[PDB]
Every structure is written in C-alpha cells, then in structure tokens.
Amino acid sequence: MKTQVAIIGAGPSGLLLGQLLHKAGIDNVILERQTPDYVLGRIRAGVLEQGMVDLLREAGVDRRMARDGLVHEGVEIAFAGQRRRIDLKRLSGGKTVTVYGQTEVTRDLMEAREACGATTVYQAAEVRLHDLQGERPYVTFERDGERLRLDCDYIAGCDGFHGISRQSIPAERLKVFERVYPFGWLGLLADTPPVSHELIYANHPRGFALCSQRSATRSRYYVQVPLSEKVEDWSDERFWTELKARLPSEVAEKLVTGPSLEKSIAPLRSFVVEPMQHGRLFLAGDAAHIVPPTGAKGLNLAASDVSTLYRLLLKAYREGRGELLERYSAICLRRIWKAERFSWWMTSVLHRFPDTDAFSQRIQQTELEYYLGSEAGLATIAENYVGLPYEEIE
Amino acid sequence: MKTQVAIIGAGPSGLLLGQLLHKAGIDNVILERQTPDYVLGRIRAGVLEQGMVDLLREAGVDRRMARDGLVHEGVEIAFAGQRRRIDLKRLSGGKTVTVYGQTEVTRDLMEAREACGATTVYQAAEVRLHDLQGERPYVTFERDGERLRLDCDYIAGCDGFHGISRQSIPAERLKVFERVYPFGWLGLLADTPPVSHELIYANHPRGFALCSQRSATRSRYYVQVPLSEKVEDWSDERFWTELKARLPSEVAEKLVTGPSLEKSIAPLRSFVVEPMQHGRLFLAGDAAHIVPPTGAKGLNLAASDVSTLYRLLLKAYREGRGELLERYSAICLRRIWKAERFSWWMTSVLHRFPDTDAFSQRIQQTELEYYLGSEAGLATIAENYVGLPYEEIE
Ligand SMILES: Cc1cc2nc3c(=O)[nH]c(=O)nc-3n(C[C@H](O)[C@H](O)[C@H](O)COP(=O)(O)OP(=O)(O)OC[C@H]3O[C@@H](n4cnc5c(N)ncnc54)[C@H](O)[C@@H]3O)c2cc1C
Ligand SMILES: Cc1cc2nc3c(=O)[nH]c(=O)nc-3n(C[C@H](O)[C@H](O)[C@H](O)COP(=O)(O)OP(=O)(O)OC[C@H]3O[C@@H](n4cnc5c(N)ncnc54)[C@H](O)[C@@H]3O)c2cc1C
Ligand SMILES: Nc1ccc(C(=O)O)cc1
Numbered sequence: 095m096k097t098q099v100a101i102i103g104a105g106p107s108g109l110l111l112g113q114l115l116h117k118a119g120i121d122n123v124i125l126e127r128q129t130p131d132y133v134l135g136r137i138r139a140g141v142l143e144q145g146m147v148d149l150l151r152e153a154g155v156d157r158r159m160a161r162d163g164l165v166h167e168g169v170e171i172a173f174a175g176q177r178r179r180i181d182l183k184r185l186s187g188g189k190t191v192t193v194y195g196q197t198e199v200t201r202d203l204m205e206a207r208e209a210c211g212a213t214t215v216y217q218a219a220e221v222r223l224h225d226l227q228g229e230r231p232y233v234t235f236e237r238d239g240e241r242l243r244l245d246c247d248y249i250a251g252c253d254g255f256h257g258i259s260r261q262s263i264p265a266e267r268l269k270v271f272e273r274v275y276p277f278g279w280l281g282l283l284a285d286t287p288p289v290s291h292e293l294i295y296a297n298h299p300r301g302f303a304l305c306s307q308r309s310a311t312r313s314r315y316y317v318q319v320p321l322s323e324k325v326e327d328w329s330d331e332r333f334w335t336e337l338k339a340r341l342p343s344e345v346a347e348k349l350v351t352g353p354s355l356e357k358s359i360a361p362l363r364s365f366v367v368e369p370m371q372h373g374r375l376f377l378a379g380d381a382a383h384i385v386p387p388t389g390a391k392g393l394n395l396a397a398s399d400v401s402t403l404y405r406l407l408l409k410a411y412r413e414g415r416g417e418l419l420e421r422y423s424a425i426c427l428r429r430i431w432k433a434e435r436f437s438w439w440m441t442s443v444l445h446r447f448p449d450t451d452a453f454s455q456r457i458q459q460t461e462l463e464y465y466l467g468s469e470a471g472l473a474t475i476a477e478n479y480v481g482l483p484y485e486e487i488e
Numbered sequence: 489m490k491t492q493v494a495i496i497g498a499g500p501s502g503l504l505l506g507q508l509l510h511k512a513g514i515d516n517v518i519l520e521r522q523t524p525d526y527v528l529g530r531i532r533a534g535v536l537e538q539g540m541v542d543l544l545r546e547a548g549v550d551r552r553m554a555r556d557g558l559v560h561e562g563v564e565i566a567f568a569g570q571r572r573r574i575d576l577k578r579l580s581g582g583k584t585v586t587v588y589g590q591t592e593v594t595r596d597l598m599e600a601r602e603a604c605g606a607t608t609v610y611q612a613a614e615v616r617l618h619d620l621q622g623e624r625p626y627v628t629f630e631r632d633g634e635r636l637r638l639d640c641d642y643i644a645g646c647d648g649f650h651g652i653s654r655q656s657i658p659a660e661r662l663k664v665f666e667r668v669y670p671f672g673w674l675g676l677l678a679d680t681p682p683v684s685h686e687l688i689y690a691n692h693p694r695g696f697a698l699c700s701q702r703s704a705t706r707s708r709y710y711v712q713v714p715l716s717e718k719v720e721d722w723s724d725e726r727f728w729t730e731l732k733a734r735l736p737s738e739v740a741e742k743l744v745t746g747p748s749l750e751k752s753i754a755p756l757r758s759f760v761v762e763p764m765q766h767g768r769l770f771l772a773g774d775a776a777h778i779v780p781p782t783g784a785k786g787l788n789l790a791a792s793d794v795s796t797l798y799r800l801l802l803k804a805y806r807e808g809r810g811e812l813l814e815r816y817s818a819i820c821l822r823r824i825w826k827a828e829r830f831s832w833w834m835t836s837v838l839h840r841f842p843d844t845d846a847f848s849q850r851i852q853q854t855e856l857e858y859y860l861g862s863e864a865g866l867a868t869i870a871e872n873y874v875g876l877p878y879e880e881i882e
C-alpha cells in the first residue's frame with residue numbers, strides 16, 4: 095500500500111492537512127486509532143482566528159461555517175465588580191474571531207474528505223513508524239487482526255498530545271519546555287441561550303469563570319477547578335450555583351440554566367517541543383505543543399503549523415524544492431512561542447493561584463487595570479487575541 | 489517652637505515639599521538626622537520623568553537643570569545579540585525623560601531653601617512624633633544635648649525607608665505588600681564619557697547590566713549581582729571586565745574605563761504600605777513605598793506624592809477645605825500601583841533569576857521579542873517609561 099504523505103491522526107490537524115493536500119494533487123492517507131464517532135464526541139474549541147477561517151475557505155470547507163458561525167468583534171473581561179469590553183475589530187485594525195465549535199469544523203472536514211474519496215483508515219491499531227531517516231519511510235498498523243504496511247515519502251504526525259509520532263523521535267534529539275498549572279477547567283455544554291452575545295472572561299476571588307457559546311441556543315461555560323476534582327462530584331446544580339457566584343450580579347440574573355449535554359475537566363498545561371521534526375517526520379498541532387485554553391490558541395496554532403507544512407510540501411512536490419522542508423521548525427516555533435506567551439499571560443491574570451502573597455494578588459489586579467485601561471494595553475491584548483499574522487515563508 | 493507643617497527628612501521629598509509650600513505662603517520646618525554633606529553623598533537616581541521636571545520648574549528650582557540636564561528621546565534594550573531602540577518621544581506622543589543626578593537636584597533644592605531663609609534643622613537627633621490624632625500634633629527632638637519641641641498642624645513623613653514616621657503609625661492600621669528579589673545592583677560612578685548617548689538596559693545570560701550617565705564626562709554603570717556579594721570583593725577592574733562581558737561586542741569595544749569615584753550595592757525590593765497616612769501624619773516617597781530601580785520610578789513617585797500632598801495642603805490652608813486631606817492615600821496609591829507594576833515587569837524581563845526552568849527562560853526571551861517588536865508593545869513600555877499622567881484631584 096503506498097501514498098505520498100501518510101497522516102497519523104484524524105483530528106482537525108490531520109483532516110485539514112489532508113484536505114489541503116488533496117486539493118493540490120498530493121495523495122495522502124490518514125490513519126486514526128479511534129472511530130469517526132469517538133472523534134466527533136470531543137467538544138473542545140469554540141473560538142477561531144481570522145487566519146483559520148481563511149484556511150478553511152482555502153480548503154473549500156467553509157459553507158456551513160459561513161452560515162452558522164458567529165463573528166465576534168469584541169470580548170469582555172470582568173474583574174472586581176466591573177466588566178470591560180475590548181473592541182477587537184477597532185483595536186486590531188479590523189480583524190475579528192469566529193465562534194464555531196471544533197466538533198462542527200471536524201464534521202465538515204470529514205464529510206468533505208468522504209465526498210472526495212480520499213483514503214482514511216479508522217481503528218488503525220498499533221501504528222508504528224519506521225525508517226524515519228531513510229529515503230523511504232513507512233508506517234505499519236493493524237486493521238482487524240492483520241498487519242498492513244503503508245509506504246510513503248513523508249509522515250505528518252497529527253496525533254495529539256498522546257500520539258505515537260512524538261514518541262518515535264529519539265528522546266535525546268528533543269528539548270522539552272513544559273509548565274503544569276495547579277488547576278483545571280470544569281466545562282459544561284448546555285442546550286440553553288448564552289447569557290451574552292460576546293464571551294465573558296471573569297476573574298473572581300473564588301476562581302476563574304468563562305461564559306461562551308456554540309450557537310444561539312447552545313452555551314458552553316467553564317469554571318476554574320482544583321486538580322483533585324472529580325467530575326462525578328459536580329452536579330449540574332452545583333455547577334450553576336458556582337458559575338453564578340463568580341459572575342457580576344447583572345449577568346448572573348439573566349442566566350438561563352439547564353441540564354448539561356456534556357460535562358468534563360481539562361487540566362491546564364503549556365508544552366513545547368523543539369525541533370518539531372525528524373528526518374521525514376513532521377509534527378503538527380497538539381503532537382508538538384500544548385497551550386492552556388485561556389487564550390484559545392490550541393486549534394489555531396495547529397492550523398498555522400498545517401498551513402506552513404502544506405505550503406512547504408507543495409514547494410517540495412510541485413517545485414522539486416525538497417530542501418525547504420528543513421525550515422519547518424524554525425518557522426512554526428516563532429508563532430508558537432508568541433502564542434504560548436499570550437496564553438500564559440491570559441492564564442496568569444485571569445485565574446486564582448494557590449498560596450498567592452498579598453503583593454502578587456495586588457500585581458494581578460493591577461495588570462488588569464493597566465492593560466484594560468490603556469489604549470496601548472488594549473491593543474496588545476486584541477492583536478494577540480485575534481491572532482498574529484502567519485509568516486509567508488521563502 | 490511652632491510651624492504649620494513639620495517635615496521629617498531633607499532628602500528630595502522633604503525639600504521639594506518644603507519649597508513648594510514656602511512659595512505658597514505655608515510655613516514649614518524640615519528636620520534631618522544627618523548632615524548636609526552626608527545627604528549630598530548619596531548618588532542614587534539619574535532619570536527624571538517629564539512631570540518631575542515640571543514640578544521642579546513650578547518650585548522655581550530648575551535653572552541648573554535646564555542648563556546641565558540631558559533630555560532623552562529614546563532608550564535601548566539589548567538582548568540575545570541585538571539592541572532595540574524604543575523611541576520614547578514618538579511612541580508616547582512627545583514626552584521624554586531627563587537625566588540629571590539626584591545629587592544635583594538635591595543640591596539645587598538645598599541652595600534654594602537656604603536663600604529663602606526657610607528653617608532646616610540638621611542633625612536633629614531622636615525625632616519623635618506625638619498626638620498624631622489630636623488637633624495639635626508635635627515633634628520632639630534633640631539638638632546638641634537639649635530636647636526641643638516643635639508644634640505643628642501637620643506632619644509630612646519624608647524620611648525614607650528607615651524613617652521614624654512609618655514606625656509611628658500603629659502597625660495594626662497598616663497593610664504591607666512586599667517582595668524581595670534574590671539579587672542586588674552593583675553600581676559604579678566614573679569620571680569617564682558614557683559609552684552611549686542613550687541608556688542601554690541589557691539582558692545577558694550572565695546577568696543584567698545598565699549603561700547610564702550623569703553628564704558628558706560622567707558615567708554610571710550597574711551590573712546585577714547576587715545577595716552574598718560584598719563591595720570590597722569587587723575591584724574596579726573586575727567590574728569593568730564583568731560589565732564588558734555582559735554588553736554587545738560593538739558597545740564593549742568603545743567603552744572608556746576609569747577609576748571609580750563611588751562604588752556600592754543596592755538590593756532590589758518592592759514595598760507598598762496602605763494607607764499612607766494616619767491622623768495628621770502623611771507619608772511620602774520612600775517612607776511609604778519602594779520600587780526596584782529597574783523602572784526608574786522611585787524619585788519620580790516621590791515627586792507625585794509631594795505634588796498631591798502640596799495641592800491638598802493648599803486647599804486646606806488657603807481654601808479652608810481640611811476634609812480633602814482624607815483623599816491623599818486613595819489618590820497616590822493609584823499611581824503607585826501602576827508604577828510598582830511597571831518596575832516589577834522591567835525587573836522580571838531584564839534580570840537573570842536563580843533556578844529558572846527552561847520554560848520560564850523561554851517565556852522571558854519571548855516577552856522581550858514581543859514587546860520590542862510590536863508597535864503596541866513598544867507603546868506600553870514607552871508611556872510607562874516616561875511616566876503616566878498625574879491626577880489633578882478634586
Ligand atoms: C477545554 C478546551 C478548550 C479549548 N478551546 C480552544 C479554543 O476555543 N480555541 C483554540 O484554538 N483551541 C482550543 N483548544 C485546543 C484544541 O482543541 C486543540 O489544540 C486541537 O484539538 C488540536 O488538534 P489536533 O488535530 O492537533 O489534535 P487532536 O484533536 O488531539 O486529534 C488528534 C487525533 O489523533 C488521534 N490519535 C492519537 N494517537 C494515535 C495513534 N497512535 N494512531 C493514530 N491516531 C492516533 C487521536 O485519536 C485524535 O483523533 C481547547 C482545548 C481544550 C481541551
Ligand atoms: C540604585 C538606585 C537607583 C535609583 N535610580 C532611580 C532613578 O533613576 N529614577 C527614580 O525615579 N528613582 C530612582 N531611585 C530611587 C530614589 O533614589 C528614591 O526613591 C528617593 O531617594 C526617595 O527620596 P525620599 O526623599 O523619599 O527619601 P531619601 O532619599 O531616603 O531621604 C530621606 C531622608 O530622611 C532622612 N531621615 C531618615 N530617618 C530620619 C529620622 N528618624 N529623622 C530625621 N530625618 C531622617 C534621611 O536621612 C534622608 O535624608 C533609585 C534608588 C537607588 C538606590
Ligand atoms: N478561551 C476559550 C474560549 C472559549 C472556549 C469555548 O467556547 O469552548 C474555550 C476556550
């Protein structure tokens with residue numbers, strides 16, 4: 095069995111890359127461990143940068159998004175009994191973000207891939223990568239008891255944080271940068287109208303809270319929660335009471351509550367690996383880096399890694415410029431670090447940390463007052479929030 | 489012995505307040521523990537904000553400054569083998585800073601006070617404050633063996649971090665916010681031409697370094713140094729070698745070295761006390777708060793506390809509005825916290841911290857790249873650097 099580019103993982107990264115590649119004539123095969131249904135079960139992301147919206151358009155999978163997605167020109171930050179609105183559109187010079195669930199984006203790519211007839215092997219068990227440094231690498235896997243081999247020119251590891259691809263690179267060749275935060279996010283999806291037309295990030299003494307949405311009849315809420323927490327400990331009612339206690343009274347009053355459709359806890363982490371490639375293996379998305387959800391950069395960084403990889407692969411196949419692929423890591427890392435820096439900053443000013451001294455609490459409160467009250471402070475948040483420009487390569 | 493306002497401390501704070509008060513008809517007496525010579529021995533500050541330059545003018549003690557002071561429109565930040573210039577004037581909308589030694593400013597105020605004939609008691613031993621909550625507070629001290637009493641309406645504690653005034657307020661009434669940094673600054677004053685026409689703040693793997701100046705023939709340099717350091721351990725030559733090792737090669741090459749006129753080590757600290765007053769006692773300057781030198785806000789915050797106190801005292805004496813004095817702390821604290829926040833930020837991105845993990849070193853490097861490469865980042869540094877606007881009161 096042979097292809098040009100083998101893609102490990104059918105999450106948004108692998109599907110986007112596969113679609114981009116297909117449209118340009120580069121055959122690719124996606125291998126996924128789970129079932130299409132399991133993949134569609136992950137709620138995750140809700141906020142997309144302008145640049146990701148454009149990439150979706152370029153992959154020609156933007157019909158439903160253009161119809162159902164909500165474009166946002168602002169976002170709110172509540173702290174110490176006051177809400178402050180940041181005009182993204184004004185402050186960033188016209189850019190906005192789009193709220194469209196990750197579940198939907200993934201569904202759209204999956205349908206688009208099916209219609210084109212491109213190869214996708216679900217339940218590909220025991221994926222193993224071989225000859226990463228040879229001129230002919232290959233992937234082996236098992237589909238219903240029998241071991242198959244897939245030959246390729248390149249492998250794009252788009253298998254998330256627990257994928258096999260990063261594990262296939264000699265550990266000595268990698269440099270890991272990581273920070274674990276002493277808390278997680280308890281998220282709740284409900285078939286209720288969101289409490290606001292724009293997102294509200296809230297710093298409250300009891301901990302962080304965030305009011306988000308998926309559509310006009312579907313809401314997504316989060317509350318900062320300690321690591322020791324178990325989801326079965328949080329009834330829908332306890333969640334609503336907790337969420338209401340962290341929000342400004344005039345917002346908590348108009349909140350329409352309801353039974354949860356999904357409830358989960360996600361720990362916050364920062365992770366970056368350098369470089370992001372080895373021989374003919376290139377890492378992309380969560381396989382290469384994790385950012386805490388606070389800045390909504392995860393899925394967005396994956397899109398840029400993918401945009402970069404695709405353009406380099408085109409150059410390599412169509413233009414015979416195979417040497418340009420060595421620049422992959424240098425290029426992605428620049429955007430990754432600025433995004434990690436932004437997510438880190440958002441996380442530190444919005445959450446309540448354990449055993450914080452009086453001085454640090456005061457400095458935290460002051461960062462908010464400063465950045466939210468200065469025209470220049472506002473602009474730093476906004477341009478970062480809508481997403482910094484992709485580099486064009488060459 | 490009686491006056492209207494008793495002033496404890498003849499450093500820049502006490503002298504500026506005394507001068508302002510005198511020019512408006514409000515009698516005041518300054519009490520200082522040391523001799524005029526000891527006071528003039530402190531080198532300290534070199535950078536003044538626009539607002540402090542204007543206050544000096546308002547006190548009519550700006551002749552020598554207008555002649556000898558150097559106005560700066562930019563400042564440089566060197567890191568990872570690259571110098572980046574921040575155009576203060578452009579980015580802040582025209583403001584600049586003035587380099588004029590604290591020793592000179594103090595000399596100018598002292599001469600101005602002497603010429604006007606205002607009272608100043610040097611070597612006032614054992615100053616004690618009494619009846620802080622009565623309608624008639626008083627200060628007692630000793631001048632050559634005999635105990636004297638000074639009656640007043642108000643007392644302005646301008647006695648620095650180790651003064652008696654903050655110690656005279658019931659400790660239970662105060663809330664202290666403080667952070668100690670694990671390093672200090674080793675500074676060297678030399679009668680040599682500065683290596684650059686503008687200041688250069690340098691983040692280097694070996695630690696922080698700063699190239700400053702006092703005039704065209706007098707330089708002031710600093711290097712980050714561990715707490716365990718003793719000044720006698722640092723020969724002039726060791727200092728020059730160390731300073732040269734932390735600077736970019738093209739800057740270290742043109743450095744004119746020479747014998748030190750003064751050499752000292754100052755530990756870095758952040759300290760804020762809330763409130764800044766008690767009854768008829770009002771704290772100002774270093775008596776109320778300390779900021780690490782990195783942002784050059786110390787003397788500048790003292791000026792704003794003083795500007796605020798003087799205007800409130802005028803209202804009280806001339807206009808019979810004694811109740812406005814209760815607003816002193818609320819007003820000064822707003823500016824103090826933003827300045828503490830700025831100094832804290834400058835300190836964290838420019839210095840090398842002990843036992844720093846790979847992630848934090850990377851985030852530090854990235855803060856520099858971000859703020860120094862974005863038009864909005866630059867503007868946040870600049871407007872903070874030149875100094876945020878004073879509030880007008882009322
Ligand atoms: C609470 C939460 C909120 C977030 N909010 C946002 C937001 O609003 N905006 C934003 O930009 N980001 C956000 N993100 C991040 C975003 O969800 C991720 O960055 C994104 O899912 C990365 O996609 P991916 O394709 O790289 O990885 P994944 O989504 O993990 O998919 C990887 C795929 O590879 C598969 N796989 C794993 N191992 C193997 C193997 N051995 N063989 C074959 N297949 C394998 C996995 O099954 C999976 O299907 C959030 C994340 C969380 C959890
Ligand atoms: C390394 C260094 C660099 C700095 N660089 C800058 C910079 O460039 N820009 C900037 O804005 N700031 C800077 N500063 C800070 C600035 O020096 C101080 O904030 C400033 O000196 C505050 O003045 P002050 O009058 O409040 O206090 P002080 O200068 O301390 O004077 C207080 C006076 O009160 C006197 N006194 C003390 N106790 C008593 C008592 N019991 N009775 C009577 N008198 C008493 C003291 O003798 C002293 O004379 C720097 C500080 C340092 C050390
Ligand atoms: N920053 C974030 C904003 C929104 C969401 C979400 O809607 O799921 C997640 C993270």
Ligand SMILES: Nc1ccc(C(=O)O)cc1
Nearest residue numbers: 532533534700781782784
């Ligand atoms: N930030 C600072 C800048 C300059 C000086 C100084 O010249 O003495 C001190 C601190």
